[PDB]
Design a binder for these strands. Structure first.
Ligand SMILES: [Cl-]
Ligand SMILES: [Cl-]
Ligand SMILES: [K+]
Ligand SMILES: [Mg+2]
Ligand SMILES: [Mg+2]
Ligand SMILES: [Mg+2]
Ligand SMILES: [Mg+2]
Ligand SMILES: [Mg+2]
Ligand SMILES: [Mg+2]
Ligand SMILES: [Mg+2]
Ligand SMILES: [Mg+2]
Ligand SMILES: [Mg+2]
Ligand SMILES: [Mg+2]
Ligand code: NA
Ligand code: NA
Ligand code: NA
Ligand code: NA
Ligand code: NA
Ligand code: NA
Ligand code: NA
Ligand code: NA
Ligand code: NA
Ligand code: NA
Ligand code: NA
Ligand code: NA
Ligand code: NA
Lengths: 65, 194, 56, 46, 81, 119
RNA sequence: GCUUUACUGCAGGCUGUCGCUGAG
RNA sequence: AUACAGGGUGACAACCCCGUACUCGAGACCAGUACGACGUGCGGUAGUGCCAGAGUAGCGGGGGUUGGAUAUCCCUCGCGA
RNA sequence: GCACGGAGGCGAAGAACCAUGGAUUUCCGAAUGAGAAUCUCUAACAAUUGCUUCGCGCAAUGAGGAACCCCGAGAACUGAAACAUCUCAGUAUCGGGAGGAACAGAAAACGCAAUGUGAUGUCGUUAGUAACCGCGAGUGAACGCGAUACAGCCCAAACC
C-alpha cells in the first residue's frame, strides 16, 4: 500500500537495501509490541510490512540487486 | 578376395582346433582369475563384434562376463508341493546364460545400453560372453546414422525387457510362421505359454 | 508367571519410532528399518500387491 | 527418558494442537476439536 | 534467509531478570548459537553483551537470556520497543 | 606368440622398418591387417610386417601360414606402434605390406633372405 | 500332527559314464 | 423461439437471474505429421565359383512348456555342417 | 480461503478473482560429503559408469506414478464328486525394467498346393473345429476370410 512497485523500482539497489533493513526494523518493533500484549496495534500494517519486504526482495531479484 | 575378418571367423568355427585352441587354453587361465565383468579394450572376435554392430569409435564399449555353468541353482520347496512341483536338480531357468551375462554386464554400466553380445568360450564351469554396450549420451553416437537409434528413450534398459539379440531369440520370436503362435507379439500377451 | 497381565509390566522398551522418511511411527530404532516404508532397507518404497484385493 | 531436539519439537507441536477451537471461530462460523489428546488416556507416536 | 532475533520474550520472569540482573530475554531462531545471538543483539540495540544462555523451549522455539554489561541498562534498552 | 615361430634380432628389425619408411616414400605400402591380407592373396605383396604385441592374436594368426602358401616373405616387429609409425601412420598397425618397395628393393630383398635364413 | 518293510515322489550319500581334459 | 436442455429465484418460471439456439474467439491434441522443396541417384544387358552373420543349422541325453500330436516353444549337458 | 466474530486493513496508483509465464520455495525424503527416528559434524555428483583437457572438467544411472506394458520367479485351496498325471493356472504372489502407450514388424513366411497370398498388432470369424488328455475330468490353436490401420528401411562383407 503506502509502498508501491514503481517507487521500489525507482530506488537504487542501495536504497532498496536501506529500505529493506528499515521495514525489517519496523516489523521487529511491531512483533515486540505484540509480544508485550501491546494493544496500540494496527494489524493491517504488520501484514503490509511482510508484503512490502517481499516486494523489495522480488524487485532486487528482477533488477539483479 | 577373402577379408582378414573371414579368418577370425573361420578359426572360431572350431575353437578346440589349431592355434585358437592353444590361445583359449592360455587365455582362460587369466580369465579365471579375472572378475565377473571386465571391460576389455578390444573384442576377442573382431569379425563377430563388427558383424553385431561394433565400431572402433567413441561411446562403444566391450566387456567379457563370466557365468557359472549348468541348471537352476534351485532351493527345494519349504511347504506343501504336489510331486510334479517337488523338483530341484532338473529344473533349468527359462533365460539362457548368454542373457544373464548381458544383464550382469549392463548393470555394471548403468548408463550404457546393450547392443549385442557373443560367446567367447567356456571351460568346465564357466561360460564367457563378450557384451557390446553403447553410450547413448555421447555425441558421435548421437550423431552416428547407424547407432543413433539406440539413443532413443524407448530403448532405456533394452536387455531387461528382452529387447536384445539373444533376448528375442530366447523369447521364441525367431520364426514368423508355425510355432510362434504363443510367441508373438509377446510371451506375456499370449498368457505365457511358450 | 502369567504371560498375560503380569508380563505386560516389563514393556518399557522403545522400538518403533517416527520414521524420518514416511512420517509413520514404524521406524524400528533397534533395526533402523521402517516396517511401513522400508526406509533403511530399500531405496525404493515398500509396497506389495497383497495390500489390496487381487483385482484392484 | 532423554529426548532429542527434534523429538522435543514434535512433542511441543502436539501440545499446541491440544488447544481448543478459539471462541471467535465459533461466532465466525455460526457453529469441537477432534484431535484432543489427554496425556494419560491417549498415546503419542515414536 | 532466516533472522537471528525473532522478538523480545516479555513475561514476569523476564522482567525480574531485566530489572534486577540487567538481562534481556529473546525468542531466537533455534539454529542460532550463543555467539550469533550475542552479535545479533549488539548490532540491533547498540550494547555490550556479556553473556548468553540458551534454552530450547517446549514451545518449539529457542530462548536466549542475554546479560548486558554494567555499562548498558536493560530496563532502558527494552523501554524503547 | 602362438603365431610367432622365430625371433627377429633387434638390428634386423631396424633394417626392416627403415626399409619400410623408404617404401612408403619411394614405393608402395599397405597399412592395416585387412589390406595386408588382400595383398598376400592378390600376390601383390613382396614383404609383409606383423606386430608381436597384437591382442587379440586372432587378428593376425593367419598371416604366417597364409604368406607361406603364397610364397610371400614376412618379418616380425615387436612394437605395434613402431610398425604403424614406420608405415607413416599416426596410429599403430598390427600388420603392413610393402607392395612393391622403392629405392629399397635391394635392402628389402636381402632382409627377405636374412629372415629365410633365420628359419 | 505323527509313524512305517502303505502308494508316489523329492533332497542327500554311494557308484559308472561324458564335459573341464593334456603328454608317453 | 435457429433459444420449450438444465439450474437459481420466499410454491408448478421459454419471456425474473444464470444459461440454452445461432455466430465468433482462444488453448491443447492431431504433428515437427501431411503437403511443398533441397540434396542424393533409380534401373537394365553380358562376363566373373569376389562377398553375403557358427558352437549356429543339425543330432543325441535330461527337463519345462505348448493344442502341437513323431509334427510347439524354451533351458541345460554332450556332439556338430 | 473453508469461516457469517471482534478489531483493523486493502482497492479508481484498477484490488478481489481467472489464465499464462516468472520469483521465492525451510528440513527429511532416490537423498548423493559424513553421521542421525526429520537433527548434527568438518568442502563434497555418495555409489557405479561413459567421455576425458585424466581435474567430478563434461555427462549418465538411482526414485515416483491409477492401472495398462515388457522380461524374469512362480503356489495352493479347488475340479477330477477320493487321488498322483491332469485341473485351478503360467492364475495369486515375488524380482527387474520402459513408455504415453508398450510389445511386435518387412519372410530361411504361408502351403484354401496354387498360373495362389505377401511386414506387424488388433477386432470379427474360422471353432469349441484340428490337436492334447488316468483318451477321464478337462484343455485348445492356426492358415484363410471380412475389417481397422497401413510403410518401408539400415548395417556386416566383397570393392575402395
Ligand atoms: Cl539396457
Ligand atoms: Cl493364401
Ligand atoms: K493339486
Ligand atoms: Mg504366549
Ligand atoms: Mg499449555
Ligand atoms: Mg543447555
Ligand atoms: Mg502344463
Ligand atoms: Mg545425507
Ligand atoms: Mg478332488
Ligand atoms: Mg474319476
Ligand atoms: Mg500386444
Ligand atoms: Mg492349459
Ligand atoms: Mg497355419
Ligand atoms: Na545400463
Ligand atoms: Na511352450
Ligand atoms: Na500417555
Ligand atoms: Na515467539
Ligand atoms: Na494334529
Ligand atoms: Na536338447
Ligand atoms: Na513452489
Ligand atoms: Na549425477
Ligand atoms: Na572426473
Ligand atoms: Na469331490
Ligand atoms: Na480328501
Ligand atoms: Na492327463
Ligand atoms: Na477363399
Amino acid at each position: 500500500t503506502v509502498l508501491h512497485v514503481q517507487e521500489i523500482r525507482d530506488m537504487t539497489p542501495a536504497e532498496r537495501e536501506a529500505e529493506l533493513d528499515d521495514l525489517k526494523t519496523e516489523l521487529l518493533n511491531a512483533r515486540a509490541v505484540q509480544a508485550a500484549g501491546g494493544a496500540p496495534e494496527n494489524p493491517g500494517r504488520i501484514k503490509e510490512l511482510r508484503k512490502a519486504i517481499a516486494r523489495i526482495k522480488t524487485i532486487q531479484g528482477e533488477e539483479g540487486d | 578376395a577373402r577379408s582378414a575378418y573371414s579368418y577370425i571367423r573361420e578359426a572360431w568355427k572350431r575353437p578346440k582346433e589349431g592355434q585358437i585352441a592353444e590361445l583359449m587354453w592360455h587365455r582362460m587361465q587369466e580369465w579365471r582369475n579375472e572378475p565377473a565383468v571386465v571391460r576389455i579394450e578390444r573384442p576377442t572376435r573382431l569379425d563377430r563384434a563388427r558383424s553385431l554392430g561394433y565400431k572402433a569409435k567413441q561411446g562403444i564399449i566391450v566387456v567379457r562376463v563370466a557365468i557359472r555353468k549348468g541348471s537352476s541353482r534351485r532351493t527345494r520347496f519349504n511347504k506343501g508341493r504336489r510331486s510334479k512341483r517337488m523338483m530341484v536338480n532338473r529344473i533349468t531357468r527359462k533365460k539362457n546364460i548368454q542373457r544373464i551375462a548381458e544383464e550382469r554386464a549392463n548393470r555394471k554400466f548403468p548408463n550404457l545400453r546393450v547392443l549385442n553380445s557373443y560367446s567367447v568360450g567356456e571351460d568346465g564351469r564357466h561360460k564367457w560372453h563378450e557384451v557390446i554396450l553403447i553410450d547413448p549420451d555421447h555425441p558421435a553416437i548421437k550423431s552416428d546414422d547407424q547407432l543413433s537409434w539406440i539413443s532413443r528413450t524407448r530403448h532405456r534398459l533394452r536387455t531387461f525387457r528382452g529387447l536384445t539379440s539373444a533376448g528375442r531369440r530366447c523369447r521364441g520370436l525367431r520364426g514368423q510362421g508355425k510355432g510362434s503362435e504363443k510367441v508373438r507379439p509377446s510371451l506375456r500377451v499370449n498368457g505365457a505359454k511358450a | 508367571t502369567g504371560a498375560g497381565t503380569p508380563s505386560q509390566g516389563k514393556k518399557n522398551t522403545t522400538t518403533h519410532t517416527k520414521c524420518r522418511r514416511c512420517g509413520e511411527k514404524s521406524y524400528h530404532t533397534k533395526k533402523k528399518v521402517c516396517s511401513s516404508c522400508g526406509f533403511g532397507k530399500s531405496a525404493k518404497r515398500r509396497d506389495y500387491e497383497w495390500q489390496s484385493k487381487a483385482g484392484e | 527418558g532423554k529426548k532429542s531436539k527434534a523429538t522435543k519439537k514434535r512433542l511441543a507441536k502436539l501440545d499446541n494442537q491440544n488447544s481448543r477451537v478459539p471462541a471467535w471461530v465459533m461466532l465466525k462460523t455460526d457453529e469441537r476439536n477432534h484431535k484432543r489428546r489427554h496425556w494419560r488416556r491417549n498415546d503419542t507416536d515414536e | 534467509s532466516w533472522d537471528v532475533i525473532k522478538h523480545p520474550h516479555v513475561t514476569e520472569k523476564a522482567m525480574n531478570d531485566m530489572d534486577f540482573q540487567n538481562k534481556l530475554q529473546f525468542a531466537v531462531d533455534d539454529r542460532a548459537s550463543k555467539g550469533e545471538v550475542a552479535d545479533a543483539v549488539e548490532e540491533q540495540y547498540d550494547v555490550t553483551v556479556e553473556q548468553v544462555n540458551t534454552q530450547n523451549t517446549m514451545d518449539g522455539e529457542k530462548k536466549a537470556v542475554v546479560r548486558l554489561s554494567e555499562d548498558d541498562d536493560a530496563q532502558e534498552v527494552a523501554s524503547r520497543i | 606368440p602362438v603365431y610367432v615361430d622365430f625371433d627377429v634380432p633387434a638390428d634386423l628389425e631396424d633394417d626392416a622398418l627403415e626399409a619400410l619408411e623408404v617404401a612408403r616414400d619411394t614405393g608402395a605400402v599397405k597399412k592395416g591387417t585387412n589390406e595386408t591380407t588382400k595383398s598376400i592373396e592378390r600376390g601383390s605383396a613382396e614383404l609383409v610386417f606383423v606386430a608381436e604385441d597384437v591382442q587379440p592374436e586372432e587378428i593376425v594368426m593367419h598371416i604366417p601360414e597364409l604368406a607361406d602358401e603364397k610364397g610371400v616373405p614376412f618379418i616380425f616387429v615387436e612394437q605395434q606402434d613402431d610398425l604403424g609409425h614406420a608405415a607413416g601412420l599416426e596410429v599403430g598397425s598390427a600388420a603392413a605390406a610393402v607392395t612393391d618397395a622403392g629405392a629399397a628393393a635391394t635392402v628389402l630383398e636381402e632382409i627377405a633372405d636374412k629372415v629365410e635364413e633365420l628359419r
